[PDB]
Design a protein around this nucleic acid. Structure first.
Ligand SMILES: [Zn+2]
Ligand SMILES: [Zn+2]
Lengths: 87, 87
DNA sequence: GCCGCTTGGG
DNA sequence: CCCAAGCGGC
């Protein structure tokens, strides 16, 4: 995927939020900025809590196309993403 | 539990049959005799392919009460175990 | 318990 | 890609 963002239910509880540095609980809704690695050739996620992600300021117009993983979210959460992005 | 035997769909494909020595395929029906390790507070399974389990002299009168995991098997496999035990 | 395979974080 | 945790086998 060449998308800039990723959203998903946390696969583990081990990722640390880049903003607040607190861990992100398994299964919770988390979002990443996908960035190029300096260790190897490929993208790595910078994970944030859902709310922390928005606090650091993004202009995502069409979440469905711009955020990888969007379509695999529960409808409930897809709507929370769209809603949040628009505001 | 405290039961001597366990039956389940194999959690991996890595276990080797203690009768025939061949690997037990992931998700296949497998059976174990359970033994207490003197090295740690935990039970160790000797796994077997379903068919091989009966060829080594392991024997079962009441699967329902003797074999841990029996009631969680698919109906088909419950009747297979019960039938094979009676035989 | 120990260890290797697999998964996940980076 | 490297490293470490989680899981599975024993
Ligand atoms: Zn955060
Ligand atoms: Zn066998």
């Amino acid at each position: 995927s060449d998308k800039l963002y990723r959203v998903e239910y946390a696969k583990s509880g081990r990722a640390s939020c880049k903003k607040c540095s607190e861990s992100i609980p398994k299964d919770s809704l988390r979002m990443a900025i996908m960035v190029q690695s300096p260790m190897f050739d490929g993208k790595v996620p910078h994970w944030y809590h859902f709310s922390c992600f928005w606090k650091v300021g993004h202009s995502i117009r069409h979440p469905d196309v711009e955020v990888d993983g969007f379509s695999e979210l529960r409808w409930d959460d897809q709507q929370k993403v769209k809603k949040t992005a628009e505001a």
